[PDB]
Amino acid sequence: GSTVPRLHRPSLQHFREQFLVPGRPVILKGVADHWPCMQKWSLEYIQEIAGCRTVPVEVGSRYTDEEWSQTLMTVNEFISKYIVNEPRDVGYLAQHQLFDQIPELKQDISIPDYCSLGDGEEEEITINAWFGPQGTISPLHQDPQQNFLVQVMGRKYIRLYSPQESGALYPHDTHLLHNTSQVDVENPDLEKFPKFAKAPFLSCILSPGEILFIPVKYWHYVRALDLSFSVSFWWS
Ligand SMILES: O=C(O)CCC(=O)C(=O)O
Numbered sequence: 454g455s456t457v458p459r460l461h462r463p464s465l466q467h468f469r470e471q472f473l474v475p476g477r478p479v480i481l482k483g484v485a486d487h488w489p490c491m492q493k494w495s496l497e498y499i500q501e502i503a504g505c506r507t508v509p510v511e512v513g514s515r516y517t518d519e520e521w522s523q524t525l526m527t528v529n530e531f532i533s534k535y536i537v538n539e540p541r542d543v544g545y546l547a548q549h550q551l552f553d554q555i556p557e558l559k560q561d562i563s564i565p566d567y568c569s570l571g572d573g574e575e576e577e578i579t580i581n582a583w584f585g586p587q588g589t590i591s592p593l594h595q596d597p598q599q600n601f602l603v604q605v606m607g608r609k610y611i612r613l614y615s616p617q618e619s620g621a622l623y624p625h626d627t628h629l630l631h632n633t634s635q636v637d638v639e640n641p642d643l644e645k646f647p648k649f650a651k652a653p654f655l656s657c658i659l660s661p662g663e664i665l666f667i668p669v670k671y672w673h674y675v676r677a678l679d680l681s682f683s684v685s686f687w688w689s
């Protein structure tokens with residue numbers, strides 16, 4: 454593959470014509486790099502502002518695992534058990550609308566201006582938190598809206614496959630998981646999934662301050678390389 458291109462504060466028009474309309478990924482630089490979250494969100498700050506609130510936590514290496522489960526605990530409990538104290542299992546505070554739950558945190562982020570190029574209402578943009586230790590993995594899957602994934606703490610390795618390559622990604626046949634690949638991107642079973650090997654892709658390491666544009670229906674796979682906090686904006 455090649456690396457996702459990085460662009461510094463492209464104009465709305467450039468973003469619209471070269472990335473949004475054709476559905477091409479890009480990393481936006483110089484857009485979120487000075488949001489307050491970038492300097493402010495330490496573990497300690499997260500504990501102070503959110504520690505006592507209940508959050509959903511995914512436990513297990515990948516959501517496609519058979520032993521994978523979902524539970525509830527306080528943010529303080531999550532940090533203690535799954536981040537700081539030699540964790541026994543992988544825990545991920547994933548896909549959670551933390552900013553609706555805790556409006557004060559919402560002050561530390563913004564809606565990217567590029568979202569106004571969409572046809573949807575700003576109020577209907579879904580903002581999710583993704584907070585977890587090094588080693589969290591989100592299996593290869595596609596989503597039904599455009600996405601800006603903003604990296605705040607730590608880095609993520611991300612692999613992207615175009616919707617045109619769906620055949621080689623062997624989606625699950627169950628209507629429920631049909632937007633998830635059967636393939637483990639970083640250790641694929643080529644005896645069972647031979648078409649996967651030659652499928653072209655883009656990749657990147659997404660670092661703090663950077664925004665990855667994931668076009669609607671683009672397949673994406675994500676592994677945290679460090680203690681990580683990302684904020685996703687699902688928009689149309
Ligand atoms: O960061 C991750 O682990 C996955 C994020 C994702 O799938 C999304 O923002 O739609």
Ligand code: NI
Nearest residue numbers: 594595596673
């Ligand atoms: Ni996703």
